[PDB]
Amino acid sequence: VEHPEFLKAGKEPGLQIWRVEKFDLVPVPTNLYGDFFTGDAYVILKTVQLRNGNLQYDLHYWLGNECSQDESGAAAIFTVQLDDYLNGRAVQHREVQGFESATFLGYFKSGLKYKKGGVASGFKHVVPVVVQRLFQVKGRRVVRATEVPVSWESFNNGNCFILDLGNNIHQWCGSNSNRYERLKATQVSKGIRDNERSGRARVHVSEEGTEPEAMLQVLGPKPALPAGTEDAANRKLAKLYKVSNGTMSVSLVADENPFAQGALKSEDCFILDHGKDGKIFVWKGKQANTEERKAALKTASDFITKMDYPKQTQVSVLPEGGETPLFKQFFKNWRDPLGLSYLSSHIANVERVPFDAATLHTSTAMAAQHGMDDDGTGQKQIWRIEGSNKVPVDPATYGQFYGGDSYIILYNYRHGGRQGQIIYNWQGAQSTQDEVAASAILTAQLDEELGGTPVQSRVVQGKEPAHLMSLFGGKPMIIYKGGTSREGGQTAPASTRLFQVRANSAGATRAVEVLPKAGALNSNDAFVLKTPSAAYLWVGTGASEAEKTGAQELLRVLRAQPVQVAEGSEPDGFWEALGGKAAYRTSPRLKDKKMDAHPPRLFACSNKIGRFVIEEVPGELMQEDLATDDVMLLDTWDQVFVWVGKDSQEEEKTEALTSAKRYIETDPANRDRRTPITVVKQGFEPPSFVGWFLGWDDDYWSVDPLDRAMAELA
């Protein structure tokens, strides 16, 4: 019962595509994965192996434009029944032509092809040739190739076109076609030659005026052609509703912005309304009855109409305990009762390498996963911003940063065979705005006077990166909440102070001053309470040797002999110094699983017409997606790289630090405002950046990437 090919589905990790032909799944040939008839519906099952050996199922069903009404319903029916066959532990997606999700687009790096025809017209994927097709290649990072009529009417000056003739495959790009867009058109022309034609096809690329005689026979003379036509901040707001059942009825449960994990009741299903951005999630509760769970895919279509969203809205239904990290970031502190529920398919190929200082200079991957460009024991110079000039910090005070000051640290990192530099700009949260802006102005000039190659990294008091903690050898990075270290104003310390001693991957600690309240404690870290009478050394149950050894060295600065005290075993005088015992933070940290819960995503952005638009590039993070004439954002959880190309617009280069700020402000997860941003330039990327790019070639930009493939593939 209901097992035609379900047996073969989801048995091994990989990609599986079927075509719904007459209410039946017809497998698509492996060499033709990516071709999609505009008149049919498909069902795609991506099997990914979790870290714990189990399998993870991403169920996509794709709807063609010229697809019949019952063709799409048959695809949605198979998706509900395939998920039912796979124990319901699958994420289902409603993908439409030209508006599919990033998870689906990641499965096709060569690019999609939208072929004319379908089941009703009498067409099928076969390898029998003699053809005469023409594709329009649109998109810069998400490259789509829609079949168009074979005529100059379908051409334009802005895009590249591929005229298929069988024994010859002519590629043609207009006068206004961007060079990076021509590179993506070559991927499609190669995917046609090597896969569809089985390598027996001569590709002849050409441009305006230099078109061959073969093009002149099937198209004719070339007349005057027209030009091309080619997120904003709507991704900030989202809402959550509860569905009940006659007809359908939704009721608002979530106010706005982020929500709570407790509102998700297991007995019912919910809708994560984000249609303003273009996607709606449907959350199947574990106690939700069977009628509602199987009709959950239809509940989204009704909600699309009930709210008047476009038909091509992305839909993703998911079960309880199998939520995607995209969905989980809409919630305040998500907790699951190696690996987690979901595993992002684009980081599933990345091999996890734990930190080891002895081999850090060898593994670029280890540098990315921990943010350590090197061990942090290189030549460094530190300045303090007094007014409008840099003041060298006393070498004895190296490691002490006051909240009322702004600093500039120029560090020389060594890693692998190459050598580089990083410029840290530590903006204290209590520093005056004129000096804070001056620190950033001096940080930028220091870069341009150093050749424009070093790295810029704006860091705010509290959220210091992992690499910045380790710059002081064995000494911990001490952060004072206020005051200043200039000769003039020598501020006195507070009567009672509290220091949180956090440790990073490399075991280096940082002591950030916080408010002397019991709620500021954290069981994972060691804490120091400097009261006038005594001197405590709170060792959290989760604190290791690194936090303890770094906490007592902080007392060496305060000239107070510590009284080490255990968690939950503190004498009464400890609570009297804070202000009464309170419920602190006992929950542990993610550590190794923080990369899974928040996978690194790559975006392209543009601040044109006073509107900040961001386009996420799907699939595995590859070097070829970094466009030289663009400014890219790599969003790690602790850090936000901003890769700026060499051939980008002049305003885009300067408006790069603000571009990442706009990206963090508009993030629906309500990211920390103090999240550090790192400015990285093309050709001088630090190891913590290239470690996410497997197969990173150093001399990649030594030869033009277009001129490479224009001869490498032709």
XYZ file of C-alpha atoms in Angstrom:
714
model
C 0.000 0.000 0.000
C 1.387 3.360 -1.198
C 4.871 2.010 -1.946
C 5.674 2.290 -5.676
C 9.232 3.570 -5.242
C 9.095 4.624 -1.571
C 11.359 1.648 -0.834
C 14.268 3.218 -2.728
C 13.565 6.709 -1.366
C 15.706 7.895 1.528
C 17.843 4.788 2.021
C 21.253 6.371 1.328
C 22.450 9.982 1.565
C 22.066 11.801 -1.724
C 19.653 13.559 -4.047
C 16.596 11.932 -5.627
C 14.257 13.572 -8.150
C 11.014 12.182 -9.571
C 8.543 13.522 -12.116
C 4.827 13.252 -11.334
C 3.539 11.634 -14.549
C -0.172 10.718 -14.454
C -0.343 10.634 -10.643
C 2.791 8.489 -10.474
C 6.432 9.172 -9.613
C 8.688 8.739 -12.654
C 12.402 8.950 -11.746
C 14.431 11.653 -13.479
C 17.725 10.489 -15.049
C 20.674 11.280 -12.807
C 22.601 12.995 -15.618
C 19.603 15.318 -16.141
C 19.098 16.464 -12.540
C 18.338 20.177 -12.733
C 16.197 20.052 -15.862
C 12.576 20.870 -15.038
C 9.719 20.907 -17.524
C 7.692 24.076 -17.031
C 4.507 22.037 -17.550
C 5.061 19.337 -14.915
C 5.510 18.971 -11.168
C 8.417 17.174 -9.515
C 9.226 15.695 -6.110
C 12.775 15.951 -4.742
C 14.113 14.111 -1.675
C 17.548 15.159 -0.399
C 18.840 12.606 2.111
C 21.508 13.994 4.455
C 23.318 11.919 7.074
C 23.293 13.511 10.528
C 26.425 13.585 12.666
C 24.985 10.859 14.912
C 24.733 8.419 11.987
C 20.990 8.884 11.400
C 19.426 10.324 8.240
C 17.779 13.705 7.656
C 15.147 14.204 4.955
C 14.486 17.426 3.037
C 11.327 16.942 0.942
C 10.878 19.386 -1.933
C 8.117 19.308 -4.528
C 8.523 21.788 -7.383
C 5.596 23.277 -9.314
C 6.059 24.300 -12.928
C 4.566 27.482 -14.329
C 2.472 25.757 -17.023
C 1.664 22.928 -14.619
C -1.871 21.546 -14.516
C -4.041 21.859 -11.417
C -4.080 18.140 -10.595
C -0.389 17.781 -11.494
C 0.585 20.032 -8.577
C -1.930 18.399 -6.242
C -0.466 14.995 -7.067
C 2.986 16.336 -6.170
C 1.716 17.737 -2.872
C -0.049 14.428 -2.187
C 3.140 12.427 -2.754
C 5.074 14.800 -0.487
C 2.604 14.262 2.365
C 2.670 10.496 1.818
C 6.456 10.313 1.410
C 6.847 12.238 4.670
C 4.317 9.818 6.166
C 6.403 6.867 4.962
C 9.570 8.422 6.433
C 8.145 8.588 9.995
C 7.180 12.245 9.498
C 10.744 13.261 10.306
C 11.079 15.314 7.113
C 10.951 19.003 6.195
C 8.598 19.677 3.280
C 8.947 22.594 0.858
C 6.572 24.063 -1.738
C 8.887 25.327 -4.472
C 7.564 27.198 -7.506
C 9.251 28.184 -10.748
C 11.453 31.233 -10.262
C 10.746 31.477 -6.518
C 12.190 28.307 -4.970
C 13.958 28.426 -1.617
C 17.696 28.614 -1.012
C 17.745 25.053 0.332
C 16.413 23.762 -2.993
C 18.698 25.951 -5.109
C 21.697 24.590 -3.195
C 21.131 21.170 -4.779
C 21.811 22.543 -8.297
C 25.146 24.327 -8.588
C 25.282 23.995 -12.382
C 22.054 25.972 -12.669
C 18.414 25.179 -13.362
C 16.881 24.709 -16.800
C 13.192 25.390 -17.474
C 12.287 23.356 -20.561
C 9.147 24.020 -22.584
C 6.606 21.214 -22.529
C 5.443 18.596 -20.097
C 3.375 15.451 -19.732
C 0.285 16.779 -21.520
C 2.350 18.113 -24.426
C 3.987 14.677 -24.661
C 7.585 15.193 -23.548
C 9.945 13.275 -21.273
C 13.576 13.288 -20.158
C 15.374 11.038 -22.658
C 18.854 10.619 -24.125
C 18.116 9.440 -27.717
C 20.534 14.101 -31.184
C 18.873 16.768 -33.372
C 17.601 19.727 -31.338
C 17.006 23.455 -31.757
C 16.429 25.041 -28.342
C 17.249 28.448 -26.870
C 17.656 29.331 -23.195
C 17.683 32.736 -21.504
C 20.270 32.824 -18.709
C 19.156 35.151 -15.902
C 20.475 35.530 -12.375
C 23.916 36.366 -10.979
C 24.320 33.825 -8.159
C 21.069 31.877 -8.586
C 21.433 31.177 -12.307
C 18.239 30.112 -14.101
C 17.995 29.137 -17.787
C 14.428 29.365 -19.100
C 13.710 28.011 -22.571
C 12.654 30.815 -24.919
C 11.475 30.905 -28.546
C 14.278 30.594 -31.090
C 14.238 34.161 -32.413
C 15.927 37.513 -31.964
C 12.683 38.597 -30.274
C 13.753 36.685 -27.150
C 17.255 38.220 -27.061
C 18.337 41.354 -25.203
C 21.556 43.222 -24.477
C 21.614 42.538 -20.732
C 21.729 38.744 -20.478
C 23.552 35.750 -21.923
C 21.760 33.269 -24.179
C 22.447 29.638 -25.085
C 21.327 28.376 -28.499
C 21.345 24.566 -28.522
C 21.947 22.894 -31.894
C 23.010 19.388 -30.816
C 26.460 18.905 -32.318
C 27.141 22.581 -31.481
C 26.159 24.662 -28.439
C 26.428 28.396 -29.135
C 26.664 30.796 -26.191
C 25.918 34.476 -26.780
C 26.167 37.396 -24.357
C 24.868 40.902 -24.962
C 26.844 44.123 -24.852
C 25.509 44.995 -21.378
C 25.961 41.523 -19.875
C 28.047 41.623 -16.705
C 31.278 39.628 -16.815
C 30.402 37.613 -13.699
C 27.038 36.799 -15.300
C 28.904 35.451 -18.334
C 30.779 33.098 -15.997
C 27.527 31.605 -14.692
C 26.252 31.135 -18.248
C 29.315 28.988 -18.949
C 28.281 26.641 -16.139
C 24.958 26.032 -17.893
C 26.584 25.555 -21.302
C 29.034 23.071 -19.785
C 26.266 21.231 -17.937
C 24.419 20.841 -21.233
C 27.491 19.569 -23.077
C 28.858 17.126 -20.505
C 25.554 15.797 -19.123
C 22.746 16.187 -21.661
C 24.849 15.704 -24.804
C 27.274 13.335 -23.008
C 30.311 15.478 -23.824
C 29.967 15.184 -27.620
C 29.203 18.822 -28.382
C 31.471 21.690 -29.440
C 30.696 24.904 -27.537
C 31.233 28.127 -29.506
C 30.947 31.245 -27.339
C 30.365 34.599 -29.032
C 29.246 38.152 -28.318
C 27.487 40.987 -30.150
C 28.641 41.155 -33.762
C 30.902 38.077 -33.557
C 28.150 35.473 -33.914
C 28.906 32.447 -36.141
C 27.192 31.423 -39.366
C 25.217 28.702 -37.570
C 23.460 31.363 -35.496
C 22.784 33.361 -38.668
C 20.864 30.481 -40.256
C 18.457 29.663 -37.419
C 18.002 33.292 -36.289
C 18.770 35.488 -39.298
C 20.159 39.024 -39.331
C 20.734 40.672 -35.958
C 18.493 43.746 -35.557
C 18.377 46.364 -32.810
C 17.923 44.679 -29.444
C 16.637 46.253 -26.208
C 18.265 46.184 -22.770
C 17.696 44.042 -19.689
C 15.213 44.469 -16.853
C 16.830 42.356 -14.075
C 14.844 41.704 0.405
C 14.801 45.349 1.618
C 14.052 45.427 5.387
C 10.832 43.383 5.358
C 12.681 40.412 6.889
C 12.745 42.175 10.268
C 9.105 41.703 11.326
C 7.306 38.373 11.618
C 4.231 36.964 13.339
C 3.015 33.555 14.514
C -0.565 32.252 14.448
C -2.387 29.127 15.627
C -4.532 27.096 13.229
C -7.766 25.357 14.246
C -9.559 22.946 11.909
C -15.471 22.777 8.342
C -13.263 25.665 7.252
C -9.897 27.118 8.293
C -9.377 29.654 11.084
C -6.176 31.292 12.340
C -5.745 33.261 15.549
C -2.855 35.532 16.467
C -0.683 34.055 19.215
C 2.646 35.916 18.844
C 2.794 39.690 19.259
C 5.782 40.744 17.122
C 9.557 40.473 16.638
C 10.890 37.365 18.530
C 8.657 34.916 20.358
C 8.924 32.189 23.005
C 9.520 28.446 22.763
C 6.646 27.853 25.194
C 3.966 29.223 22.870
C 4.508 26.256 20.535
C 1.916 23.836 21.907
C 2.337 20.211 20.856
C -1.432 19.732 20.491
C -1.835 22.192 17.601
C -0.086 23.499 14.506
C 1.170 27.026 13.935
C 2.106 29.313 11.046
C 5.248 31.471 11.151
C 3.981 34.407 9.096
C 6.963 35.922 7.267
C 5.287 36.414 3.875
C 6.502 40.014 3.816
C 9.920 38.419 3.188
C 8.451 35.614 1.079
C 8.248 32.534 3.285
C 5.819 30.965 5.750
C 6.660 28.131 8.134
C 4.137 25.554 9.340
C 5.008 23.849 12.631
C 3.440 20.421 13.152
C 3.030 19.627 16.831
C 3.703 16.100 18.009
C 0.268 15.849 19.666
C -1.476 17.398 16.649
C -4.144 15.087 15.267
C -3.669 13.291 11.969
C -6.308 15.247 10.035
C -4.563 18.558 10.723
C -1.056 17.202 10.087
C -1.866 15.829 6.625
C -3.837 18.980 5.741
C -0.984 21.198 6.992
C 0.231 21.763 3.433
C -3.235 23.010 2.442
C -3.447 25.179 5.569
C -0.545 27.227 4.201
C -2.294 27.729 0.857
C -5.391 28.958 2.696
C -3.236 31.219 4.874
C -1.600 32.549 1.694
C -5.048 33.564 0.445
C -6.377 34.647 3.860
C -3.516 37.168 4.032
C -3.367 37.929 0.276
C 0.258 36.916 -0.162
C 1.543 36.046 -3.648
C 1.014 32.506 -4.890
C 4.783 32.009 -5.258
C 5.315 32.294 -1.503
C 7.828 29.824 -0.105
C 6.225 27.216 2.159
C 8.055 25.008 4.664
C 6.174 22.639 6.964
C 8.253 20.892 9.615
C 7.662 18.586 12.600
C 8.348 19.171 16.267
C 11.918 18.270 17.155
C 13.078 18.629 13.548
C 13.054 22.400 13.152
C 15.458 24.142 10.798
C 17.886 26.670 12.330
C 16.248 29.388 10.217
C 12.966 28.682 12.021
C 14.577 28.374 15.464
C 16.252 31.797 15.327
C 12.793 33.440 15.538
C 12.679 32.401 19.216
C 14.198 33.618 22.477
C 16.785 31.038 23.581
C 15.734 27.860 21.773
C 16.558 24.653 23.657
C 16.239 21.044 22.481
C 15.406 18.485 25.242
C 26.905 15.051 18.649
C 24.516 17.059 16.489
C 21.094 18.631 16.856
C 17.625 18.308 15.324
C 18.495 19.665 11.872
C 21.787 19.852 9.973
C 22.078 22.518 7.279
C 22.743 20.738 3.993
C 25.441 23.238 2.967
C 27.588 22.644 6.085
C 27.001 18.878 6.142
C 30.102 18.386 3.960
C 32.342 20.403 6.310
C 34.459 18.104 8.475
C 34.480 19.240 12.102
C 38.005 19.974 13.331
C 38.439 20.798 17.042
C 41.023 23.329 18.141
C 44.679 22.411 18.634
C 47.255 25.183 18.974
C 50.050 22.893 17.771
C 48.368 22.375 14.376
C 46.532 25.707 14.069
C 49.068 27.069 11.573
C 48.321 24.066 9.315
C 44.506 23.893 9.185
C 42.724 26.872 7.674
C 39.483 25.103 8.614
C 40.394 25.103 12.304
C 41.026 28.848 11.992
C 37.513 29.498 10.683
C 35.554 27.352 13.142
C 37.162 29.067 16.150
C 37.876 32.551 14.778
C 41.613 32.217 15.510
C 43.618 33.634 12.619
C 46.633 32.471 14.634
C 47.533 31.750 18.253
C 47.650 35.462 19.120
C 51.353 35.715 20.009
C 52.640 38.064 17.324
C 53.963 41.596 17.122
C 51.211 44.014 18.165
C 50.878 47.722 18.932
C 48.045 49.273 20.954
C 46.867 52.894 20.917
C 44.299 54.783 22.983
C 42.166 57.466 21.328
C 42.602 60.728 23.255
C 40.758 63.441 21.362
C 41.768 63.329 17.695
C 45.044 61.378 17.842
C 46.358 57.954 18.820
C 48.134 57.673 22.181
C 50.363 54.604 22.752
C 49.141 52.497 25.665
C 51.561 51.734 28.493
C 53.067 48.291 27.711
C 52.572 47.318 31.362
C 48.812 47.884 30.994
C 48.531 45.756 27.823
C 45.315 43.790 28.243
C 43.357 46.341 30.290
C 40.650 48.213 28.389
C 38.485 50.854 30.053
C 34.864 51.315 29.044
C 35.228 55.073 28.706
C 37.999 54.758 26.108
C 38.375 53.637 22.508
C 41.439 51.711 21.362
C 43.209 50.641 18.176
C 45.257 47.427 18.108
C 47.452 46.668 15.094
C 48.365 42.970 15.115
C 50.527 40.956 12.712
C 49.168 37.427 12.316
C 51.236 34.563 10.915
C 49.501 31.433 9.630
C 50.495 28.921 6.998
C 53.111 30.214 4.607
C 51.674 33.718 4.291
C 51.751 36.623 6.746
C 49.052 39.217 7.369
C 47.745 42.003 9.611
C 44.590 42.802 11.585
C 43.445 46.170 12.939
C 41.135 45.965 15.946
C 38.999 48.970 16.908
C 37.715 48.401 20.454
C 34.915 50.919 21.031
C 34.063 51.151 24.718
C 30.358 51.273 25.494
C 30.885 54.266 27.809
C 33.243 56.278 25.588
C 32.211 59.684 24.284
C 30.812 59.723 20.764
C 33.447 62.114 19.399
C 36.303 59.787 20.369
C 34.407 56.676 19.244
C 33.980 58.167 15.775
C 37.596 59.351 15.816
C 38.755 55.815 16.620
C 36.888 54.511 13.575
C 38.264 57.310 11.391
C 41.796 56.599 12.616
C 41.236 52.855 12.141
C 40.311 53.448 8.496
C 43.212 55.801 7.790
C 45.612 53.355 9.450
C 44.433 50.728 6.968
C 44.767 52.922 3.876
C 48.202 54.131 4.984
C 49.239 50.496 5.527
C 48.577 49.774 1.842
C 44.861 49.062 2.182
C 45.523 45.364 2.895
C 45.137 44.763 6.681
C 41.881 43.647 8.260
C 39.448 45.988 10.014
C 37.350 44.701 12.921
C 34.952 46.927 14.860
C 34.432 45.396 18.310
C 32.251 46.763 21.120
C 32.734 46.323 24.867
C 31.264 42.952 25.778
C 31.298 41.082 22.462
C 35.036 40.634 21.858
C 36.045 38.034 19.246
C 37.944 34.885 20.110
C 41.146 36.042 18.407
C 41.225 39.309 20.377
C 41.220 37.530 23.752
C 44.404 35.585 22.994
C 46.583 38.533 21.912
C 48.054 38.986 25.415
C 50.056 35.776 25.769
C 48.865 34.217 29.008
C 47.302 37.313 30.520
C 43.504 37.627 30.259
C 41.836 40.505 28.442
C 40.520 42.676 31.284
C 37.582 44.955 30.443
C 36.499 47.616 32.935
C 32.923 48.855 32.741
C 33.875 52.523 32.971
C 36.658 54.989 33.633
C 39.653 55.836 31.488
C 43.397 55.177 31.416
C 44.572 58.609 30.246
C 47.012 60.663 32.309
C 44.528 63.479 32.923
C 41.380 61.770 34.150
C 42.302 59.064 36.666
C 38.886 57.766 37.687
C 38.419 55.905 40.962
C 37.003 52.360 40.914
C 33.594 51.474 42.276
C 33.177 50.155 45.811
C 31.938 46.723 44.681
C 32.760 45.317 41.241
C 31.994 42.079 39.392
C 34.096 40.499 36.631
C 32.865 37.715 34.343
C 35.775 35.536 33.184
C 34.857 33.994 29.830
C 37.084 31.490 28.024
C 37.363 30.822 24.296
C 38.436 27.838 22.195
C 42.159 28.471 22.756
C 41.759 28.547 26.551
C 42.524 32.278 26.727
C 40.253 34.150 29.128
C 38.705 37.613 29.207
C 37.468 39.409 32.329
C 34.580 41.745 31.464
C 33.197 43.921 34.257
C 29.446 43.635 34.839
C 26.907 44.940 37.327
C 27.287 43.585 40.886
C 24.016 41.624 40.861
C 23.443 37.928 41.502
C 21.528 37.532 38.232
C 24.649 38.337 36.194
C 26.292 35.057 37.245
C 26.798 32.167 34.828
C 27.576 28.575 35.797
C 29.843 28.112 32.757
C 32.264 30.909 33.688
C 34.329 31.890 36.697
C 33.423 35.176 38.373
C 35.333 37.631 40.568
C 33.589 39.816 43.161
C 35.753 42.676 44.485
C 34.077 43.849 47.707
C 35.833 46.293 50.077
C 35.953 43.690 52.875
C 36.908 40.465 51.074
C 37.801 39.191 47.588
C 35.906 36.251 46.095
C 36.675 33.855 43.229
C 33.425 32.226 42.128
C 34.169 28.991 40.263
C 31.149 27.909 38.256
C 30.328 24.227 37.979
C 30.936 24.526 34.232
C 34.149 26.510 34.607
C 37.272 24.577 33.647
C 40.969 25.056 34.442
C 41.264 27.957 31.983
C 38.695 30.167 33.728
C 40.164 29.515 37.184
C 43.780 30.204 36.223
C 42.705 33.371 34.403
C 40.493 34.577 37.250
C 43.214 34.616 39.912
C 45.567 36.478 37.572
C 42.928 39.219 37.479
C 43.287 39.470 41.263
C 47.017 39.961 40.679
C 46.006 43.213 38.975
C 43.624 44.184 41.793
C 46.273 43.327 44.444
C 43.640 41.370 46.407
C 44.216 37.797 47.567
C 41.213 35.749 46.382
C 38.992 33.470 48.441
C 38.004 30.721 46.017
C 34.358 29.762 46.537
C 32.254 27.087 44.836
C 28.896 27.374 43.096
C 25.916 26.923 45.390
C 28.342 26.764 48.334
C 28.949 30.447 49.012
C 29.092 31.946 52.517
C 26.406 34.453 53.428
C 28.741 37.430 53.013
C 28.993 36.726 49.293
C 25.273 37.263 48.691
C 25.288 40.379 50.891
C 27.868 41.995 48.604
C 25.736 41.441 45.492
C 22.312 42.435 46.805
C 20.467 39.225 47.587
C 20.543 35.769 46.037
C 18.887 35.556 42.623
C 18.340 32.979 39.884
C 21.319 33.268 37.538
C 22.127 31.441 34.271
C 22.745 27.733 34.886
C 22.183 26.575 31.299
C 25.442 25.507 29.595
C 26.915 26.803 26.345
C 26.787 25.238 22.891
C 30.559 25.157 22.216
C 30.924 22.492 19.515
C 27.279 22.580 18.393
C 27.182 26.371 17.957
C 28.182 25.960 14.305
C 25.232 23.626 13.691
C 22.641 25.805 15.433
C 23.792 28.886 13.474
C 25.454 27.820 10.225
C 27.536 30.396 8.320
C 25.538 31.981 5.510
C 26.883 34.063 2.624
C 25.046 37.082 1.199
C 25.488 39.674 -1.520
C 24.193 43.169 -0.831
C 23.622 46.511 -2.529
C 22.648 49.911 -1.120
C 21.070 51.237 -4.319
C 18.189 53.740 -4.447
C 18.325 54.193 -0.671
C 17.212 50.600 -0.110
C 19.384 47.909 1.455
C 18.779 44.698 -0.519
C 20.536 41.427 0.333
C 20.618 38.286 -1.819
C 21.683 35.057 -0.128
C 23.775 32.707 -2.253
C 22.751 29.076 -1.631
C 24.720 25.852 -1.524
C 28.169 25.177 -0.142
C 30.334 28.243 0.419
C 32.604 28.330 -2.637
C 35.257 30.831 -3.691
C 33.619 31.266 -7.115
C 30.610 32.962 -5.475
C 32.755 35.944 -4.371
C 32.197 38.434 -7.184
C 35.083 40.858 -7.668
C 32.615 43.659 -8.505
C 30.539 43.091 -5.370
C 30.519 43.278 -1.573
C 29.693 39.996 0.164
C 28.610 39.266 3.735
C 29.599 36.067 5.549
C 27.475 35.831 8.694
C 29.066 33.644 11.302
C 27.263 33.694 14.626
C 29.947 35.501 16.647
C 31.341 37.535 13.730
C 30.084 39.150 10.519
C 32.710 39.232 7.780
C 32.163 41.697 4.923
C 34.224 40.590 1.917
C 34.594 43.630 -0.358
C 35.675 43.031 -3.937
C 38.433 44.902 -5.712
C 36.148 46.109 -8.539
C 33.169 47.209 -6.437
C 31.602 50.666 -6.468
C 33.474 53.337 -4.525
C 30.506 54.132 -2.275
C 29.903 50.423 -1.652
C 33.475 50.040 -0.361
C 33.031 52.804 2.219
C 29.415 51.882 3.011
C 30.559 48.346 3.890
C 30.754 48.600 7.683
C 27.320 50.244 7.674
C 26.042 47.572 5.282
C 26.732 44.873 7.871
C 25.168 47.039 10.585
C 21.999 47.296 8.494
C 22.210 43.527 8.013
C 22.408 42.903 11.763
C 19.694 45.451 12.592
C 17.249 43.888 10.110
C 17.932 40.288 11.171
C 14.674 38.815 12.555
C 16.624 36.961 15.270
C 17.267 40.290 17.067
C 21.025 39.912 17.028
C 23.193 41.637 19.600
C 23.891 45.223 18.558
C 27.520 44.840 19.723
C 28.119 41.916 17.328
C 31.608 42.564 15.899
C 32.004 43.194 12.173
C 35.184 42.302 10.278
C 36.164 44.095 7.066
C 38.078 41.766 4.738
C 39.350 42.787 1.305
C 39.767 40.698 -1.834
C 43.089 38.883 -2.106
C 44.087 39.432 1.544
C 41.555 37.241 3.316
C 42.571 36.006 6.790
C 42.520 32.260 7.535
C 39.347 32.569 9.636
C 37.560 33.585 6.402
C 38.939 31.108 3.843
C 38.532 28.173 6.237
C 34.818 28.071 5.432
C 35.650 27.740 1.709
C 36.749 24.187 0.982
C 38.898 24.116 -2.130
C 40.036 27.720 -1.702
C 42.627 28.521 -4.384
C 45.174 31.187 -3.471
C 46.055 32.353 -6.998
C 42.392 32.171 -8.057
C 42.210 35.874 -8.933
C 45.693 35.791 -10.490
C 43.901 34.919 -13.738
C 40.476 36.329 -14.536
C 37.787 33.808 -13.485
C 35.926 34.433 -16.751
C 39.084 34.112 -18.860
C 39.751 30.900 -16.925
C 36.471 29.145 -17.743
C 36.279 30.798 -21.177
C 39.247 28.605 -22.124
C 39.112 25.897 -19.444
C 35.616 24.804 -20.501
C 35.601 25.906 -24.162
